[PDB]
Amino acid sequence: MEATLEQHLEDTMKNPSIVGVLCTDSQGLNLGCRGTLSDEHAGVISVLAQQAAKLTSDPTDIPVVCLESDNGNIMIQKHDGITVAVHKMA
Amino acid sequence: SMTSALTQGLERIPDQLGYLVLSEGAVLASSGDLENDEQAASAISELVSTACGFRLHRGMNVPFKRLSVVFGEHTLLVTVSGQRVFVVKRQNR
Numbered sequence: 001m002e003a004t005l006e007q008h009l010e011d012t013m014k015n016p017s018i019v020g021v022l023c024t025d026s027q028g029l030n031l032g033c034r035g036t037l038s039d040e041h042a043g044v045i046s047v048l049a050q051q052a053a054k055l056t057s058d059p060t061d062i063p064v065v066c067l068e069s070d071n072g073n074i075m076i077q078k079h080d081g082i083t084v085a086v087h088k089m090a
Numbered sequence: 091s092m093t094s095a096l097t098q099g100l101e102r103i104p105d106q107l108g109y110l111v112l113s114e115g116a117v118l119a120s121s122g123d124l125e126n127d128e129q130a131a132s133a134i135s136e137l138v139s140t141a142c143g144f145r146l147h148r149g150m151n152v153p154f155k156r157l158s159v160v161f162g163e164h165t166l167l168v169t170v171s172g173q174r175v176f177v178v179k180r181q182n183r
């Protein structure tokens with residue numbers, strides 16, 4: 001545990017509820033993804049994370065772009081300068 | 091009346107502060123803070139148009155039921171039924 005980025009990807013996946021993770025920073029570029037998420041989603045997650053921030057009249061309001069549905073709900077928070085994509089079961 | 095009655099109030103709901111409806115990329119109705127400005131009307135439309143285009147190839151063709159976007163002090167919950175988009179704007183708890 002010198003804290004590596006692939007630690008957390010394998011680490012948050014411990015949870016039965018957590019089904020996949022993916023990371024991106026504002027490019028559409030996959031920086032590692034587990035579970036349900038793959039490279040198709042890197043671009044889509046960035047853009048909705050990116051456009052949802054336009055509703056931020058000004059910044060420092062970090063909109064976790066939560067996204068409900070049948071298979072699961074999908075939080076999306078632009079975060080530590082890197083957009084994170086959790087996929088839970090609620 | 092009873093222990094289990096009016097007297098026992100029932101769980102409050104956070105206040106609403108904006109409401110919005112668009113149809114065909116056009117504001118049908120709008121109240122609250124979502125006045126007539128084309129900030130949220132325009133901005134959500136492509137947020138909706140992009141968020142709607144996230145198929146995920148596991149449950150295919152239907153990329154959501156509802157799209158919340160949470161802020162610190164206020165929330166947006168968006169719905170679409172046949173290219174009529176609803177946003178409710180409220181408080182968080």
